[PDB]
Structure 1
């Protein structure tokens, strides 16, 4: 047939420090000219066996393509297997040097790095998103004979194969290993269906770690479980629930109508809105200050603040921080989710927006929103590649409001009745837990550290824990603690729980 393509060397993927994540490995593809193969039928059984193929089934294949001038025998053999076939010296058997990807960290960064197809083209994750950058251009050599199939001359070798370009990801493999191990262990300890964990640099917008459970070995090109290949952190949507309350609180503080010391009466732990009932879990409260509403995670408390300030102000904070918004990461199949909106907000939708019931967001959007809040209200564009020059970013929340909300979230973790399991020994950590009824539950924790100068934002999402305790503060908060403690030390972040220096 017409023309053969010389596969280009696909670009190397590394983590932010140059540790290899996806490496192009030489493989040998064997093809044949059936016309010449017919001249050596006594060689076919040995050839069939060297290719693993059945003697009769292989002979059937060749005879069927007797007219064809080219056919593929086998693709992607190791250079050792490919040479064994060439050692047989079978007339009409030819070889082409192809490429296949090897993933040294395997299952650890599978979803982030991605996977390639049979033609070495990106199929998932980064491999897919930066395919054009990584692929380069195939080789151009005119296969010329006369009228047979025996390449008489290697004539015009013009614009030949151009190698693909190297790509350094934002991922730090050291933090990725830790995040992977801890999420894997929590899934097992909780008998959970799935999970996601995202670590972000609040200053640069870099994704330092992104792990999901279940995971798969991208080096094992058979079995391929589609559910295990899902990059849940970027493709699965969920109700963020109580994890959005810091954004409702940001709108309250920016309104001019609320201060942290203000009190909201949440008695009797229920609130009547038309034919709908807002309900708190622990209904043992009356007066709660704004920090108290977050510690007790009062849906009633947050809904009352929402009615006073208006849903517009809340929606705008949530929209500006990127919840239910396009991340601009350009990963095909990435889910945008939904942030409900109205011209005229009824009372029930105002409340559910405020406590995160009406919405669908991804783990990446949630971590990005928490990064804006942690970075004194400045949102920095999300990046899956190493950021050397930080873009300007947008001041979505005023520095004063974001700083107040950070202090309240520090109290959520440290105060009496708080999320003590999120505490990071040696540092001041801040965050908010979430528990969403899908009885099936989703356990959440979103936070950042150190509170003195936030460096890392983290989201821990545990899908369907199956033990007695399913609450976010019980299931996800310790994962945050464990991952945070290690990540801050791996990044040499100085401990900040110090004696008033």
Structure 2
């Protein structure tokens, strides 16, 4: 009497299957969900329940689309539609593996990474370490990561947030990349004392060098030209404090204190990435705006759905958001090339030279944010969130890559330090080679 609907599949942008159903027998008919890639993109895809409905992930949140509606006899069965993701399984597989060995090598508690298409903001890869296997019973996997931290778990960004100050000061014509500044080792601002991460007297850092060397003091001096109102407006245009609408369950909105509630010291903290929180996806989406010539396109992971007849409907594209002009975006991209620039004499070296890939205009920004100690409500001394966000490449943006490491003891490649730059190096370099992308003078970070 009951006419069962057949569950739809979940496939990547090229129709490579991530989840699909086969008929079997036991209540005799029994549909078996198949995950041919095992843990591959399981943070996104999710898993199935005993009744063949979604248990978590997209299997759950899109269950109505995937499950259809059982018929009867007449009411015809509406079979489940197929969900086409923006993911590229080849990119996802490489990124997910690289994230696992970044976690193992660095000693971090966890690692995650997001790759966006520069122009469209589509999610090409989204991965975390320790990803569970939905072909196995969830109850045996308490030691696994079952969720999707890239969207669910916000963090204080620290210096990766400096993209906002850089964009604001250029967009309003308050500085230029080659302006020679005078940057002291510390300043008193908003009642508090801000110090750079290295001891130094007044240094002739250029604006480029302020972001290339990650001078907090230089960032706040330039932010003082912008002012609180224009700065807060730029934060909002970059999408912070708001869910992206990416189409994934459990997305956090992050947290940004609205300006009418700022303390006297908020403005001394936000421009260097303290006092607010964002997800990895939000962080990566910020750099997508700059990659796409100033136009932020909210990321999406659902590309299309295919009805049981086989007719395909593309997902509606989100509306453009103009953050800065194309000219500003191009200037900020070029400036952030300084971060990955190497200099044997030290003087013109950025914070992340291992992120550079020779032959390509890689551009990005490092972050090292002190974590809050839950036992005191106060900052740890030696526990960090490490971030990197970059663009491949500055002259031809194709890929935007965001990475976060939860308190690594070492570099992402296992060398001493605390940097995610090597993981960006590996991923961005591999993306260039696999598409056979073809290969000026050194940027000045420090004047006389």
Q: Please, what TM-score do these two structures have when normalized by structure 1?
A: 0.77
| Corresponding position: 1:425 with 2:422 | no
Indicate the SS of the match to 1:108: coil
Contact 1:426 1:497 in 2 (8 A): no
How is 1:271-286 mapped onto 2 (pairs within 5 angstroms)? 271-273=187-189, 275-285=191-201, 286=203
Matched with 1:35 is none
Distance 1:346 1:289, change over 3 A: farther
| Corresponding position: 1:191 with 2:107 | yes
Larger RCO (CA within 8 A; separation ≥ 6) = 2
Indicate the SS of the match to 1:440: strand
| Corresponding position: 1:99 with 2:26 | no
The CA deviation string for residues 268-295 of structure 1, in whole angstroms up to 9 with x for no partner, is x111235521121112252211111112
Counterparts of 1:472 and 1:347 in 2: how far apart (Å)? 38
Indicate the SS of the match to 1:302: helix
| Corresponding position: 1:393 with 2:337 | no
**Greater Cα shift, 215-224 or 327-336:** 327-336
Contact 1:443 1:464 in 2 (8 A): yes
Distance 1:401 1:468, change over 3 A: closer
Counterparts of 1:7 and 1:493 in 2: how far apart (Å)? 48
Matched with 1:251 is 168
* Structure number with bigger Rg: 1
Counterparts of 1:412 and 1:137 in 2: how far apart (Å)? 54
How is 1:121-160 mapped onto 2 (pairs within 5 angstroms)? 121-140=53-72, 157-160=73-76
| Corresponding position: 1:26 with 2:23 | yes
* Shift, 1:257, TM fit: 2.1
Indicate the SS of the match to 1:445: strand
* Shift, 1:344, TM fit: 7.1
Structure 1 residues not aligned, in runs of 5+: 28-78, 83-94, 141-156
Q: Which is helix-richer, 1 or 2?
A: 1
What RMSD in Å do the two structures reach over aligned CA positions?
2.5
* Shift, 1:258, TM fit: 1.7
Matched with 1:13 is 10
Match of 1:413 among 337, 340, 359: 340
How is 1:26-105 mapped onto 2 (pairs within 5 angstroms)? 26-27=23-24, 79=25, 82=26, 95-105=27-37
Matched with 2:214 is 297
| Corresponding position: 1:166 with 2:109 | no
Distance 1:493 1:205, change over 3 A: farther
Contact 2:410 2:417 in 1 (8 A): no
Counterparts of 1:224 and 1:449 in 2: how far apart (Å)? 36
* Shift, 1:13, TM fit: 0.8
Counterparts of 2:6 and 2:19 in 1: how far apart (Å)? 12
| Corresponding position: 1:113 with 2:30 | no
Counterparts of 2:98 and 2:16 in 1: how far apart (Å)? 21
| Corresponding position: 1:361 with 2:278 | yes
Counterparts of 1:125 and 1:401 in 2: how far apart (Å)? 38
* Shift, 1:6, TM fit: 5.2
Counterparts of 1:266 and 1:295 in 2: how far apart (Å)? 14
Counterparts of 1:258 and 1:471 in 2: how far apart (Å)? 37
Counterparts of 2:261 and 2:160 in 1: how far apart (Å)? 25
Contact 1:434 1:472 in 2 (8 A): no
Counterparts of 2:207 and 2:264 in 1: how far apart (Å)? 20
| Corresponding position: 1:313 with 2:230 | yes
Counterparts of 1:298 and 1:168 in 2: how far apart (Å)? 44
Structure 2 residues not aligned, in runs of 5+: 305-313, 343-347, 372-381, 442-448
Matched with 1:143 is none
Contact 1:425 1:485 in 2 (8 A): no
Matched with 1:203 is 119
The CA deviation string for residues 316-364 of structure 1, in whole angstroms up to 9 with x for no partner, is 2221121221111243321111112223755521121101111110011
* Shift, 1:158, TM fit: 2.2
Matched with 2:307 is none
The CA deviation string for residues 87-136 of structure 1, in whole angstroms up to 9 with x for no partner, is xxxxxxxx342323211111121101112222222232222332222111
Match of 2:397 among 434, 451, 454: 454
How is 1:450-489 mapped onto 2 (pairs within 5 angstroms)? 450-467=393-410, 474-489=418-433
